[PDB]
Amino acid sequence: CLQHRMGTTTIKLVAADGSPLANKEVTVKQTKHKFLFGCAEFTSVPYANNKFEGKQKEKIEERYEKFFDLFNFVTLPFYWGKFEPVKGKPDTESLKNAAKWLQTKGVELKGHPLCWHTETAPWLLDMSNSEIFSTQIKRIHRDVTDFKGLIDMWDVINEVVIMPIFDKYDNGITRICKDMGRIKLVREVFKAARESNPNATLLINDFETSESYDILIEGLLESGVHIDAIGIQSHMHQGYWGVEKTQEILERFSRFKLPIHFTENTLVSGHLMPPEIVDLNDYQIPEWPSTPEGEERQAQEAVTHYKTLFSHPLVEAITWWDFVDGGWLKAPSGFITQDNRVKPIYHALHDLIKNQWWTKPMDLISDENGLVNVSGFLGEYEVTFDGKSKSFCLDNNNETVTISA
Amino acid sequence: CLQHRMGTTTIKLVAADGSPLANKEVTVKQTKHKFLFGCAEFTSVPYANNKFEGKQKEKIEERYEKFFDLFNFVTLPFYWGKFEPVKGKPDTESLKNAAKWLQTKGVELKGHPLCWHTETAPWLLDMSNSEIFSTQIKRIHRDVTDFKGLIDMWDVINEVVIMPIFDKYDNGITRICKDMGRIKLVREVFKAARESNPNATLLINDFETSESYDILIEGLLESGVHIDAIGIQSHMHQGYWGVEKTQEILERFSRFKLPIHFTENTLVSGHLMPPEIVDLNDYQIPEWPSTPEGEERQAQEAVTHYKTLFSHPLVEAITWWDFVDGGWLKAPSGFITQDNRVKPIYHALHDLIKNQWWTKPMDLISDENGLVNVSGFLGEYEVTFDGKSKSFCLDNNNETVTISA
Numbered sequence A, B: 001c002l003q004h005r006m007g008t009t010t011i012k013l014v015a016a017d018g019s020p021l022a023n024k025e026v027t028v029k030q031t032k033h034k035f036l037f038g039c040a041e042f043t044s045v046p047y048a049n050n051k052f053e054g055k056q057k058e059k060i061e062e063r064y065e066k067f068f069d070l071f072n073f074v075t076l077p078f079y080w081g082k083f084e085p086v087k088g089k090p091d092t093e094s095l096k097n098a099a100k101w102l103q104t105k106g107v108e109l110k111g112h113p114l115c116w117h118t119e120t121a122p123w124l125l126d127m128s129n130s131e132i133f134s135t136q137i138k139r140i141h142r143d144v145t146d147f148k149g150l151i152d153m154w155d156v157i158n159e160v161v162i163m164p165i166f167d168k169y170d171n172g173i174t175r176i177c178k179d180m181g182r183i184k185l186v187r188e189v190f191k192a193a194r195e196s197n198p199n200a201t202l203l204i205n206d207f208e209t210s211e212s213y214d215i216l217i218e219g220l221l222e223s224g225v226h227i228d229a230i231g232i233q234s235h236m237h238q239g240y241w242g243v244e245k246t247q248e249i250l251e252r253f254s255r256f257k258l259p260i261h262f263t264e265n266t267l268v269s270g271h272l273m274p275p276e277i278v279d280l281n282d283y284q285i286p287e288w289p290s291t292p293e294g295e296e297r298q299a300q301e302a303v304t305h306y307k308t309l310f311s312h313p314l315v316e317a318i319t320w321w322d323f324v325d326g327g328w329l330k331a332p333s334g335f336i337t338q339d340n341r342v343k344p345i346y347h348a349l350h351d352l353i354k355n356q357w358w359t360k361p362m363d364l365i366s367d368e369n370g371l372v373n374v375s376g377f378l379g380e381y382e383v384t385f386d387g388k389s390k391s392f393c394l395d396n397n398n399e400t401v402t403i404s405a
Helices: A045-049 A053-066 A091-105 A123-127 A129-148 A172-178 A182-196 A211-222 A244-254 A290-308 A343-357 B044-048 B054-068 B092-104 B122-126 B128-145 B172-180 B182-196 B212-220 B243-258 B292-312 B343-358
Strands: A006-013 A025-033 A037-039 A074-076 A109-114 A153-158 A201-206 A229-236 A260-266 A316-318 A364-367 A373-376 A379-383 A388-394 A402-405 B006-013 B027-033 B037-039 B074-079 B108-112 B153-158 B201-207 B231-237 B261-268 B315-320 B364-365 B372-376 B377-387 B388-394 B401-403
Touching: A006 A379, A006 A388, A006 B044, A025 A373, A037 A109, A045 A053, A045 A074, A045 A091, A045 B212, A074 A091, A091 A109, A091 A129, A091 B054, A109 A201, A123 A172, A129 A172, A129 A182, A153 A182, A172 A182, A172 B074, A182 A201, A182 A211, A182 B212, A201 A211, A201 A260, A211 A244, A211 B182, A211 B212, A229 A244, A229 A343, A244 A260, A244 A290, A260 B182, A290 A316, A290 A343, A364 A373, A373 A379, A373 A388, B006 B377, B006 B388, B027 B372, B044 B054, B044 B092, B054 B343, B074 B092, B074 B315, B092 B108, B092 B128, B108 B201, B122 B172, B128 B172, B128 B182, B153 B182, B172 B182, B182 B201, B201 B212, B201 B261, B231 B243, B243 B261, B243 B292, B292 B315, B292 B343, B364 B372, B372 B377, B372 B388
Parallel strands: A006 A402, A037 A074, A037 A316, A074 A109, A109 A153, A153 A201, A201 A229, A229 A260, A260 A316, B006 B401, B037 B074, B037 B315, B074 B108, B108 B153, B153 B201, B201 B231, B231 B261, B261 B315
Antiparallel strands: A006 A373, A025 A364, A025 A379, A379 A388, B006 B372, B027 B364, B027 B377, B377 B388
């Protein structure tokens, strides 16, 4: 029942002259998941730009050791307000340094978000709608082009269902979305991003899980917009959804036969957030501590959540939002506390991802033609023999990979 | 403030040879509204097919006198389950007789609904989705063609937001809508209806007033579907919306610059329906009496509702659902009781529509060229002189109408 997450490849071992390494004993092991187990990680920016020193840096590096032993995917911040507070002077270099550092850790990268009404550029409010739109399109061209080859996945536009009717504060993006409409805006931002990076994975993202989001997506697809993956947020501060609700959402959004990314996951290990709060940002409390029984609940619920999503074929990524407690809403939504205590949820998900869902080392022998069949979870593998180690991909297409001296 | 509801025309009075009737004293009066003040009227079917006799018929005719003194628009029933309970044997003649009778009363007609998951054809459940769709399209061709020239306005498809996720019972329309999607289905039913009647007014209708309906409409329009009017239901058994909520809905649906029809209006003159009930059809209570204070509330709320809608330029029709108490849900939702007592709401809306919103007789004299300028509410008028009476339209286009012997 996790067959769709697994595969078989044949590798061929040859000498330099093409002759088979026959009856050769080898060891094969998984080194990476193809499935994207991600986490937002915004500390990478100040870290990779040498903003920390001494024991604060050691404490942060301690957390990175745990982080990279679990995740293979990272969401990076591109909020226009933060990325370009001064018009014409983007923070390109800072995030290049962050992406290049993360790239040496061998994690996939996504940038988030290119277009959003929250934390957008404040100076937009001085421009006409015509100019705002023109500038948003140029922002996309610029940033997608500059990070091509380095960040090739994007949340292009975010929370489009509420975007035009957002009333918490005036912003440029609500203005243009109200002016030209959700569908025209989405079409143009996707067009612009594709123009700048033919190989980019382009997401639309939203927290809205009711029929307004699936109707929007149906309208976009029928109007010629090409979406590479549907992003669904999963901030469950007010209580875990449960399996049944999760599966109703998965089935309904699966009708499009597009990859589904669970883009932003939260379960808290303290008291739940009151259920009547609509916009989560309105819940501003001074302190929100983690509790022991809350940590047990968080761990159990997180396992059930990850299992439910991994079990669904069209799901292709699960991204946790806050790795450390006291992030967004100062919530205990992390796997690690601020004083670097590893919470039960880390042990639970580490066991799930790096043990239960991990193919164990295999001792194999090549046949007369130097062929070795490998079965396991889709991802990256190594074959070892003669003290040499060689990487290969284990994917769906049963094409034989040749490996030489 | 109701300028958009009014206009000016010049009429030219000429003898049979084209020579002007100069300095001719005439009387002009309004005979009809252009604005569609409608009411569903399903009794027309048994009435016009001679199903009533004696004093039941007299009692019904008594109500029709009041009905036609108020309304200029009628919604007729085309529920597929009722219209064609036996496959291949539609109830065409019955509704032809009803429409022809109503036509002699000079009221505009709309048929409702051509495609809907509720009270559809039960025998669809024996067919494949392919056949269901094929048959629904043929139903539309047939009925739109047969009633061309007689019924030229249609609720083509109804409650599309819930249609694919409707789970109260299995039906053929939910099946095909889930299969091919809301947008493809709507496109095809509108295409088919337009093919059968180029001059037809084609509505989509829904009770859903949240952003899921306006997002659906935006998707339809962007996918090339041409909608003549947006239908919004307004069944307020659980309490009048209020002006503020009504106006938020009007503004939001006005962005499409299409006519808006308020297709099904209900306010009750007894106790309100409990607010937590989602599906109104579930509220099946043995008795639901009208009260005096409830009738005062009903009248005042109905005036406020009609005023709010009439004041909004893009609104072009308001249709009450039940003219007589004890109709749908046996609710006191009518203007008249079952023992033919005229309720306050009738007197309130009659005064509003046929007095406050009615241009009073004008005594005018034509100039040397036989020209008479007429101002008033858009609609049909008569000019009278020499004991002769002549109809003309008062509309937006500044066109002089000539009137001869």
